[PDB]
């Protein structure tokens, strides 16, 4: 109904304004921390190195910024556009995740990227639906074996359907939410909370880019980098189901 | 269909490797240059400041890089707010749309924790509103087309082709209103190039949301209504991106 959708608009609007109030409250008091840290670094350096004027240190920092902004990395193997990192980057497009922790610097890069996505995203959506159906099949089938037990226990066939759906997501959650977060904690030296934050920002395809796992391979652990790609694929497919149903839940409400 | 799933996987896989080759070809040289420039900057500074070891300069740069990466600005030493009510509103929008530009990061663990639940609840809620607006926008467009469609049918062009021509006009005007119009708008408003603007538009409407380009984010602009109003466009454009793709899919099926 047109009347109802107007209502929905207003609700959302309120969901946004409410969000805004909370993020402002939680983040505004720390807006300025990074400046402060940069200035602390400058002042410390001047005190240690009397041959340097503040203004000269200023130019250095500008020149460094320009280079970093072009893709330079502070060094003390790190190419973001070598074959493996470019592969990953292409993934971040067709998934629509779009971390963006590495920017395109060329107009050709941008131009090509437009067509790459227009063609790539729908193509990927198709494969995702495919994997979603095939993965759900495997899950529901396994759960079906557990269902056999409930039905013998004379638990009503209606509840058995429900227990399976809870199981369906709960087991997925374990494999695609919980398992990875515990993995990343140890591998990335993130905190548990940072890891779950990352996981969820990823599987929702929000893809902020403040945290990114799989851009480069890890020596002494080869299986890591692919398993992450494999994970993103399977998890995104799982998360589709999660999202559709929370939606049905909301429609019911 | 198990055979097709495997074929599709191999295809995508090739679409990625092909992407990787192209992005590396288009971006690696620029990046390799930047890395060089950073090292030139270092070497130049050492030659001018004998009180500084290479290794000490290395640490300074790592520290500066971390701060810039946290959103410190090289130009100033220290008014405008990234988390003012309007920018936070916008930020919330970037979540539920799953666009996720990420040009301003959350710094607090509370911010992250809240963000998780905000999205889980926000995205499906939005998807519902989007489907709604998609149907309603297509309806209004389809009704408008009808009157001009009357003219084509009188001109004795077959009903099968008139349907096709109308689609061309249907998308062409949508495109005009939601792709072309905004890109021309942003060119003038943001001081981007035409190519940068289309790049931004499309990165946005695909929900990739890299974050290299963000309308309104510019600090200098005195433009309060601007940034939420842009969201008005985002709403209308995304739904149309959606609804059209959906109907196309149904026609294909």
């Amino acid at each position, epitope marked *: 109904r047109s009347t109802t959708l107007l209502a929905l608009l207003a609700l959302v609007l309120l969901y946004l304004v409410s969000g805004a109030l909370v993020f402002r409250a939680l983040e505004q008091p720390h807006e300025q921390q990074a400046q402060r840290e940069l200035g602390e670094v400058r002042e410390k350096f*001047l005190r240690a190195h009397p*041959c340097v004027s503040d203004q000269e240190l200023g130019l250095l920092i500008k020149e460094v910024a320009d280079a970093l902004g072009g893709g330079a990395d502070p060094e003390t193997s790190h190419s973001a556009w070598d074959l493996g990192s470019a592969f990953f980057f292409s993934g971040t497009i067709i998934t629509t995740i779009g971390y963006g922790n590495v920017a395109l610097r060329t107009d050709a890069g941008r131009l090509f990227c437009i067509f790459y996505a227009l063609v790539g995203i729908p193509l990927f959506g198709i494969l995702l639906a495919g994997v979603g159906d095939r993965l759900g099949s495997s899950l529901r089938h396994g759960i079906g074996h557990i269902e056999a037990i409930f039905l013998k226990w004379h638990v009503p066939p209606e509840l058995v359907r429900v227990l399976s759906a809870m199981l369906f997501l709960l087991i997925g959650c374990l494999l695609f939410v919980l398992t990875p977060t515990f993995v990343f904690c140890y591998m990335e030296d993130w905190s548990k909370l940072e890891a779950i934050y990352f996981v969820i920002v990823t599987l929702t395809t929000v893809g902020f880019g403040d945290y990114v796992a799989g851009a480069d391979p890890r020596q002494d652990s080869p299986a890591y980098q692919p398993l992450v790609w494999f994970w993103i694929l399977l998890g995104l497919a799982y998360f589709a189901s999660v999202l559709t149903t929370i939606g049905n839940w909301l429609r019911v409400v | 269909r198990s055979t097709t799933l495997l074929a599709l996987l191999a295809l995508v896989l090739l679409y990625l490797v092909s992407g990787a080759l192209v992005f590396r070809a288009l971006e690696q040289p620029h990046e390799q240059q930047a890395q060089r420039e950073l090292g030139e900057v270092r070497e130049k500074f050492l030659r001018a400041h*004998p009180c500084v070891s290479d290794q000490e300069l290395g640490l300074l740069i790592k520290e500066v890089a971390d701060a810039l990466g946290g959103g410190a600005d090289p130009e100033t*030493q*220290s008014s405008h707010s990234a988390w003012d009510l309007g920018s936070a509103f916008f930020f919330s929008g970037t979540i539920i749309t799953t666009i996720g530009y990420g040009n301003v990061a959350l710094r607090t663990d509370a911010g992250r924790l809240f963000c998780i639940f905000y999205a889980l609840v926000g995205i499906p809620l939005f998807g519902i509103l989007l489907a709604g607006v998609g149907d309603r926008l297509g309806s209004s467009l389809r009704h408008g087309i009808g009157h001009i469609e009357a003219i084509f049918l009188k001109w004795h062009v077959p009903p099968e082709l008139v349907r096709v021509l109308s689609a061309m006009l249907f998308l062409l005007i949508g495109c005009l209103l939601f792709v072309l119009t905004p890109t021309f708008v942003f060119c003038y408003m943001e001081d981007w190039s035409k190519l940068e603007a289309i790049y931004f538009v499309i990165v946005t409407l695909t929900t990739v949301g890299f974050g290299d380009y963000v309308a309104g984010a510019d600090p200098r602009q005195d433009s309060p209504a601007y940034q939420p109003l842009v969201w008005f466009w985002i709403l209308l454009g995304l739904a149309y991106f959606a609804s059209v793709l959906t109907t196309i899919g149904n026609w294909l099926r």
Partner: antibody
Amino acid sequence: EVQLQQSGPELVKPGASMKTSCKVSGYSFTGYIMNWVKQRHGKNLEWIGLINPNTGYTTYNQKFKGKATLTVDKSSSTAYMELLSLTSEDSAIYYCTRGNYVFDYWGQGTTLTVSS
Amino acid sequence: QIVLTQSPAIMSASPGEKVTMTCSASSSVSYMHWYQQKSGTSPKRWIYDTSKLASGVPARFSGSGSGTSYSLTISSMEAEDAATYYCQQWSNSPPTFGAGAKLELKR
């Protein structure tokens, strides 16, 4: 014993320019930033600019951008300041002083008098 | 660009008296430095980085403060302390000075 020895008082006509010096001893001239400061009689101190004796690099107070040129002679470890197009408001005491965050050593000052 | 205000610009103390002069900044700085000047002669670094004493300076002097508010204190005035004290900052280029606070002997 660090010491910055400034040259003597100078008296010049309005319009003319003037160059004054500061010879350092007791430390190595090229290791430290040199600044100049203006004190018009018994009033606020005003930073004019700095020079890096090692690199030649200079930066100035906006107030003094056109007015003052800083230079150094490395061999004689001496710093120079030229003031241009002098007017009456330039009459003051001028100091060379050392430092990149605090001014830890100062010359004894030199008095400029501008007058017809 | 950053402005430092020292107020009052004149004050007076008997010997033995405790003396406190303040410096308020137009916007926050990380450190404040102070000079002592006696008429006839150049300024001397007195206190730097807020609370560190230069070589010569006796212990009756101390400094403190933070952000936008800084102070110089004499626990117990002496006669040779009569002078003009200036604050200065260099957390932002260009460096800048307070307009000085003159401390005279009471009688």
